[PDB]
């Protein structure tokens, strides 16, 4: 699935706002915290 | 279980860095506050899920 | 000087498929790693180009210029030398000339009286060395307007190698008062067909000429009749309005394209 | 302060425990930069407007204009012009711009007909002899010329077309003097029953009333922002500065951002570059031809973390998705929408994956989550 | 239906009154584009 | 709020510059009528 996510992340890991106003926020739980649960 | 938490600013999107367009956008009232709130409610729900 | 070179063989016109050739940068803008979609006058993919030779042969008819033209020549000794473009060609209106002589290129717009069977002439006759000697093109040019010329050089006027080493490609459009030229050079090692592959044409020059073009004809290199014509050839395709998808790579060069209506 | 901005956002004097959104921050530009192509030739408007003789409305003179400074304010600020109407620019703005190419058209027309020149009109001028395109960008400039070419018998050199088989395309020219067939009959020869010579003449005698008098028209028409510009207003260019936020203008690409040396390999014919979003991300300076990457100068969402009004007026500020090396860049020597700025004193600054958090002590304890920041970080109010 | 889809290219070319009719077109259409996107996203969020 | 709902009547009665402003009203109202239908269908699709 990251082979699809990485497309979305570069088109839209300190994510930042694009000039069109699009912003991608981080989840509250990291993939390491979901792995630990 | 979730989808990417995306927040769009309705002011930045409609009127990006124009104060002229921002002054006109205010004539429509709350629609940008309501749209930023609606997207923020979706973003909070991804953590809940 | 105008003259009729009727010492030529009579056959029908040849045809061949364009393949994916005849794509050019649609606007003067940089893009990179992008799949851009554009609507413009392109040569449709896998379309019938007509095919013409000078060899026995001197295929130099007047052809339509409807919506502009892809022209490409498989070349040796530089036999393809220029083009005449216009709406009458017999002095009653303006017309455009392009010539590459041995030294410097000339581009001119005037109310020309063109010769019916024009050419440029090179002499080898008992001199063991090719030398530029004749130009037969127009008698008169009175009300002349756009004047342009290159800085001077010398090109080669000699060559008797086997397969064609040079492909020279051009696209011409007469739109919004500008005659836009796109052109490109590639080496190739191929005998009698357009090379299958992909490469774009860059804008060569932008000419503010305004004039009506309806038809066009090509100027080739060559005791006033009877001669030797060296083996060289050119292909002609007509542009059409189409939508194209263009792969700009990491350098910002077009490396592949899709014709949306193919 | 950030707390009072949350009180104002939530419409309450008491804000509850949580993390809240506020105004986005954005480093405002320090200064303007103008970069027009460095030329000096003043444009040939003299022999456009103050010309000897003027073509007919069927044979309208076209003069191309290029490689020159066009002070359109010198035309517009004259008292002489009766009309100066413009269809994709305002006449005050013309100096602030460069154009890809320009055509001045010219003719003389009767004063009652000048209303026909405007784009997408109709009438015998607009339908059969001079049509402006329905999306025209340019200006139509008109004035009376009665005392310049009227003759007391009449200046019968001014002709116009009344008859044409079908309405002409925009900017089409028609010099034809062939005879027109109104009825069903063929009409070979110079004349006949219901056959017409398609050109008629104006009675330009200096005696006539306004509306019947001869009016001089120019149409300035021009194309925009898709080629290396050839004509510009007299706006002085300025020294090019980099890495600072500025109100740039290159050839009429007005914008706001930071300029920097790009590694982009533009080919010699390209002047602008664009992103995947098709917004212009790079420009080639028209004076000293290097490629500079237009980057939007730092901005982002701002969020305020509070334990609730009941407990404290302490708050922490999350600058969403920005490295806070760019928070000291927001020094009050230039403006931002967030007019408040005391947090910048620092000593409790913490970079997170979610952006940079100011005003909160980072600890190596992991407690239960309380106020959620993102990327595994939470905040809470404790000793 | 405005003279441009680029917002600065309107404010550069026109004045403080002729621009507003063009800016309001972009405000109207853009706002509708967000109202659409947010509706698709609210209905999507309900499915997720 | 156009002069008529019949698309070809506006094009016959008015000139090409005024008729464009009448067709702007029909396109906008119909497009809102379609967006209303598709939003209502998406809410129904979620219920089904
Ligand atoms: C070349 O041959 C053509 C005919 O094949 C000649 O063209 C004629 O020219 C005269 C005027 O000189 C016209 O009245 C004829 O109508 C033309 N014929 C055609 C079919 O167009 C031409 O004159 C010859 N030129 C030379 C230099 O020999
Ligand atoms: C340097 C040189 O030879 N220039 C010639 C020029 O004199 C001539 O007018 C033109 C037309 O053939 O061709 C070229
Ligand atoms: C744009 C234009 O005027 N094109 C004309 C065309 O209409 C005409 O048929 C042709 C020869 O008559 O000359 C050219
Ligand atoms: C800042 C700048 O580039 N100024 C140029 C100068 O360098 C050049 O010598 C002159 C003539 O071309 O035109 C101007
Ligand atoms: C820690 C603490 O005392 N919190 C107080 C709560 O007891 C009080 O009831 C409320 C209303 O004043 O404000 C808050
Ligand atoms: C090319 O044109 C000829 C007629 O001139 C036609 O017979 C032939 O089928 C065409 N080529 C293709 C690929 O259809
Ligand atoms: C031989 O070619 C040269 C080219 O400079 C020319 O000057 C000379 O007159 C030619 N002589 C003959 C006999 O062709
Ligand atoms: C064009 O050429 C003809 C013949 O010399 C002449 O009558 C006409 O006036 C010329 N036009 C110009 C603009 O010189
Ligand atoms: C252009 O792209 C190719 C393919 O990735 C690469 O080899 C080449 O180094 C690039 N050009 C430059 C100037 O780096
Ligand atoms: C026209 O000429 C007069 C001088 O004869 C001058 O005052 C006026 O400014 C000129 N107008 C233009 C548009 O050149
Ligand atoms: C947190 O732990 C790191 C070592 O993992 C240490 O360098 C740092 O000083 C500690 N900070 C505090 C506030 O204890």
JSON list of N, CA, C and O in Angstrom, two decimals, chain D residues 314-339:
[
{"chain": "D", "resi": 314, "resn": "UNK", "atom": "N", "xyz": [-1.97, 29.71, 30.52]},
{"chain": "D", "resi": 314, "resn": "UNK", "atom": "CA", "xyz": [-0.90, 29.13, 29.72]},
{"chain": "D", "resi": 314, "resn": "UNK", "atom": "C", "xyz": [-1.51, 28.52, 28.45]},
{"chain": "D", "resi": 314, "resn": "UNK", "atom": "O", "xyz": [-2.53, 27.84, 28.53]},
{"chain": "D", "resi": 315, "resn": "UNK", "atom": "N", "xyz": [-0.85, 28.69, 27.31]},
{"chain": "D", "resi": 315, "resn": "UNK", "atom": "CA", "xyz": [-1.16, 27.98, 26.06]},
{"chain": "D", "resi": 315, "resn": "UNK", "atom": "C", "xyz": [0.13, 27.68, 25.32]},
{"chain": "D", "resi": 315, "resn": "UNK", "atom": "O", "xyz": [1.13, 28.36, 25.49]},
{"chain": "D", "resi": 316, "resn": "UNK", "atom": "N", "xyz": [0.11, 26.66, 24.46]},
{"chain": "D", "resi": 316, "resn": "UNK", "atom": "CA", "xyz": [1.21, 26.34, 23.56]},
{"chain": "D", "resi": 316, "resn": "UNK", "atom": "C", "xyz": [0.72, 26.43, 22.12]},
{"chain": "D", "resi": 316, "resn": "UNK", "atom": "O", "xyz": [-0.45, 26.15, 21.85]},
{"chain": "D", "resi": 317, "resn": "UNK", "atom": "N", "xyz": [1.57, 26.83, 21.20]},
{"chain": "D", "resi": 317, "resn": "UNK", "atom": "CA", "xyz": [1.20, 27.09, 19.81]},
{"chain": "D", "resi": 317, "resn": "UNK", "atom": "C", "xyz": [1.88, 26.09, 18.91]},
{"chain": "D", "resi": 317, "resn": "UNK", "atom": "O", "xyz": [3.10, 25.98, 18.90]},
{"chain": "D", "resi": 318, "resn": "UNK", "atom": "N", "xyz": [1.09, 25.34, 18.15]},
{"chain": "D", "resi": 318, "resn": "UNK", "atom": "CA", "xyz": [1.55, 24.42, 17.13]},
{"chain": "D", "resi": 318, "resn": "UNK", "atom": "C", "xyz": [1.48, 25.12, 15.77]},
{"chain": "D", "resi": 318, "resn": "UNK", "atom": "O", "xyz": [0.40, 25.39, 15.25]},
{"chain": "D", "resi": 319, "resn": "UNK", "atom": "N", "xyz": [2.64, 25.38, 15.18]},
{"chain": "D", "resi": 319, "resn": "UNK", "atom": "CA", "xyz": [2.75, 25.82, 13.80]},
{"chain": "D", "resi": 319, "resn": "UNK", "atom": "C", "xyz": [2.72, 24.58, 12.90]},
{"chain": "D", "resi": 319, "resn": "UNK", "atom": "O", "xyz": [3.71, 23.85, 12.81]},
{"chain": "D", "resi": 320, "resn": "UNK", "atom": "N", "xyz": [1.58, 24.30, 12.28]},
{"chain": "D", "resi": 320, "resn": "UNK", "atom": "CA", "xyz": [1.33, 23.03, 11.61]},
{"chain": "D", "resi": 320, "resn": "UNK", "atom": "C", "xyz": [2.19, 22.87, 10.36]},
{"chain": "D", "resi": 320, "resn": "UNK", "atom": "O", "xyz": [2.18, 23.72, 9.47]},
{"chain": "D", "resi": 321, "resn": "UNK", "atom": "N", "xyz": [2.94, 21.77, 10.29]},
{"chain": "D", "resi": 321, "resn": "UNK", "atom": "CA", "xyz": [3.69, 21.39, 9.10]},
{"chain": "D", "resi": 321, "resn": "UNK", "atom": "C", "xyz": [4.78, 22.37, 8.64]},
{"chain": "D", "resi": 321, "resn": "UNK", "atom": "O", "xyz": [5.01, 22.50, 7.44]},
{"chain": "D", "resi": 322, "resn": "UNK", "atom": "N", "xyz": [5.45, 23.07, 9.57]},
{"chain": "D", "resi": 322, "resn": "UNK", "atom": "CA", "xyz": [6.60, 23.92, 9.25]},
{"chain": "D", "resi": 322, "resn": "UNK", "atom": "C", "xyz": [7.75, 23.72, 10.23]},
{"chain": "D", "resi": 322, "resn": "UNK", "atom": "O", "xyz": [7.54, 23.57, 11.43]},
{"chain": "D", "resi": 323, "resn": "UNK", "atom": "N", "xyz": [8.98, 23.71, 9.73]},
{"chain": "D", "resi": 323, "resn": "UNK", "atom": "CA", "xyz": [10.16, 23.76, 10.57]},
{"chain": "D", "resi": 323, "resn": "UNK", "atom": "C", "xyz": [10.30, 25.16, 11.19]},
{"chain": "D", "resi": 323, "resn": "UNK", "atom": "O", "xyz": [10.42, 26.16, 10.48]},
{"chain": "D", "resi": 324, "resn": "UNK", "atom": "N", "xyz": [10.33, 25.24, 12.51]},
{"chain": "D", "resi": 324, "resn": "UNK", "atom": "CA", "xyz": [10.37, 26.51, 13.24]},
{"chain": "D", "resi": 324, "resn": "UNK", "atom": "C", "xyz": [11.69, 27.26, 13.18]},
{"chain": "D", "resi": 324, "resn": "UNK", "atom": "O", "xyz": [11.75, 28.35, 13.76]},
{"chain": "D", "resi": 325, "resn": "UNK", "atom": "N", "xyz": [12.71, 26.83, 12.43]},
{"chain": "D", "resi": 325, "resn": "UNK", "atom": "CA", "xyz": [13.72, 27.80, 11.97]},
{"chain": "D", "resi": 325, "resn": "UNK", "atom": "C", "xyz": [13.06, 28.97, 11.24]},
{"chain": "D", "resi": 325, "resn": "UNK", "atom": "O", "xyz": [13.55, 30.10, 11.32]},
{"chain": "D", "resi": 326, "resn": "UNK", "atom": "N", "xyz": [11.90, 28.76, 10.62]},
{"chain": "D", "resi": 326, "resn": "UNK", "atom": "CA", "xyz": [11.11, 29.81, 9.97]},
{"chain": "D", "resi": 326, "resn": "UNK", "atom": "C", "xyz": [10.18, 30.59, 10.92]},
{"chain": "D", "resi": 326, "resn": "UNK", "atom": "O", "xyz": [9.46, 31.49, 10.47]},
{"chain": "D", "resi": 327, "resn": "UNK", "atom": "N", "xyz": [10.18, 30.33, 12.23]},
{"chain": "D", "resi": 327, "resn": "UNK", "atom": "CA", "xyz": [9.48, 31.19, 13.20]},
{"chain": "D", "resi": 327, "resn": "UNK", "atom": "C", "xyz": [10.30, 32.43, 13.58]},
{"chain": "D", "resi": 327, "resn": "UNK", "atom": "O", "xyz": [9.76, 33.52, 13.46]},
{"chain": "D", "resi": 328, "resn": "UNK", "atom": "N", "xyz": [11.60, 32.36, 13.95]},
{"chain": "D", "resi": 328, "resn": "UNK", "atom": "CA", "xyz": [12.47, 33.54, 14.03]},
{"chain": "D", "resi": 328, "resn": "UNK", "atom": "C", "xyz": [12.49, 34.41, 12.77]},
{"chain": "D", "resi": 328, "resn": "UNK", "atom": "O", "xyz": [12.62, 35.63, 12.87]},
{"chain": "D", "resi": 329, "resn": "UNK", "atom": "N", "xyz": [12.30, 33.83, 11.58]},
{"chain": "D", "resi": 329, "resn": "UNK", "atom": "CA", "xyz": [12.13, 34.59, 10.32]},
{"chain": "D", "resi": 329, "resn": "UNK", "atom": "C", "xyz": [10.91, 35.53, 10.38]},
{"chain": "D", "resi": 329, "resn": "UNK", "atom": "O", "xyz": [10.95, 36.63, 9.83]},
{"chain": "D", "resi": 330, "resn": "UNK", "atom": "N", "xyz": [9.87, 35.16, 11.13]},
{"chain": "D", "resi": 330, "resn": "UNK", "atom": "CA", "xyz": [8.69, 35.98, 11.42]},
{"chain": "D", "resi": 330, "resn": "UNK", "atom": "C", "xyz": [8.94, 37.05, 12.52]},
{"chain": "D", "resi": 330, "resn": "UNK", "atom": "O", "xyz": [8.07, 37.32, 13.35]},
{"chain": "D", "resi": 331, "resn": "UNK", "atom": "N", "xyz": [10.13, 37.66, 12.57]},
{"chain": "D", "resi": 331, "resn": "UNK", "atom": "CA", "xyz": [10.43, 38.79, 13.46]},
{"chain": "D", "resi": 331, "resn": "UNK", "atom": "C", "xyz": [9.59, 40.02, 13.06]},
{"chain": "D", "resi": 331, "resn": "UNK", "atom": "O", "xyz": [9.33, 40.24, 11.88]},
{"chain": "D", "resi": 332, "resn": "UNK", "atom": "N", "xyz": [9.16, 40.85, 14.02]},
{"chain": "D", "resi": 332, "resn": "UNK", "atom": "CA", "xyz": [8.18, 41.94, 13.80]},
{"chain": "D", "resi": 332, "resn": "UNK", "atom": "C", "xyz": [8.67, 43.10, 12.90]},
{"chain": "D", "resi": 332, "resn": "UNK", "atom": "O", "xyz": [7.94, 44.04, 12.63]},
{"chain": "D", "resi": 333, "resn": "UNK", "atom": "N", "xyz": [9.91, 43.00, 12.40]},
{"chain": "D", "resi": 333, "resn": "UNK", "atom": "CA", "xyz": [10.45, 43.83, 11.32]},
{"chain": "D", "resi": 333, "resn": "UNK", "atom": "C", "xyz": [9.68, 43.67, 9.99]},
{"chain": "D", "resi": 333, "resn": "UNK", "atom": "O", "xyz": [9.75, 44.57, 9.14]},
{"chain": "D", "resi": 334, "resn": "UNK", "atom": "N", "xyz": [8.91, 42.60, 9.80]},
{"chain": "D", "resi": 334, "resn": "UNK", "atom": "CA", "xyz": [7.86, 42.53, 8.78]},
{"chain": "D", "resi": 334, "resn": "UNK", "atom": "C", "xyz": [6.56, 41.90, 9.33]},
{"chain": "D", "resi": 334, "resn": "UNK", "atom": "O", "xyz": [6.54, 41.29, 10.40]},
{"chain": "D", "resi": 335, "resn": "UNK", "atom": "N", "xyz": [5.46, 42.14, 8.63]},
{"chain": "D", "resi": 335, "resn": "UNK", "atom": "CA", "xyz": [4.11, 41.78, 9.08]},
{"chain": "D", "resi": 335, "resn": "UNK", "atom": "C", "xyz": [3.78, 40.29, 8.87]},
{"chain": "D", "resi": 335, "resn": "UNK", "atom": "O", "xyz": [4.34, 39.60, 8.01]},
{"chain": "D", "resi": 336, "resn": "UNK", "atom": "N", "xyz": [2.82, 39.82, 9.66]},
{"chain": "D", "resi": 336, "resn": "UNK", "atom": "CA", "xyz": [2.11, 38.54, 9.58]},
{"chain": "D", "resi": 336, "resn": "UNK", "atom": "C", "xyz": [0.67, 38.77, 10.07]},
{"chain": "D", "resi": 336, "resn": "UNK", "atom": "O", "xyz": [0.41, 39.72, 10.81]},
{"chain": "D", "resi": 337, "resn": "UNK", "atom": "N", "xyz": [-0.29, 37.91, 9.68]},
{"chain": "D", "resi": 337, "resn": "UNK", "atom": "CA", "xyz": [-1.68, 38.02, 10.18]},
{"chain": "D", "resi": 337, "resn": "UNK", "atom": "C", "xyz": [-1.75, 37.85, 11.71]},
{"chain": "D", "resi": 337, "resn": "UNK", "atom": "O", "xyz": [-2.29, 38.73, 12.38]},
{"chain": "D", "resi": 338, "resn": "UNK", "atom": "N", "xyz": [-1.13, 36.80, 12.30]},
{"chain": "D", "resi": 338, "resn": "UNK", "atom": "CA", "xyz": [-0.77, 36.75, 13.72]},
{"chain": "D", "resi": 338, "resn": "UNK", "atom": "C", "xyz": [0.10, 37.94, 14.17]},
{"chain": "D", "resi": 338, "resn": "UNK", "atom": "O", "xyz": [1.33, 37.90, 14.07]},
{"chain": "D", "resi": 339, "resn": "UNK", "atom": "N", "xyz": [-0.53, 39.01, 14.66]},
{"chain": "D", "resi": 339, "resn": "UNK", "atom": "CA", "xyz": [0.16, 40.20, 15.17]},
{"chain": "D", "resi": 339, "resn": "UNK", "atom": "C", "xyz": [0.88, 39.94, 16.50]},
{"chain": "D", "resi": 339, "resn": "UNK", "atom": "O", "xyz": [1.92, 40.54, 16.77]}
]
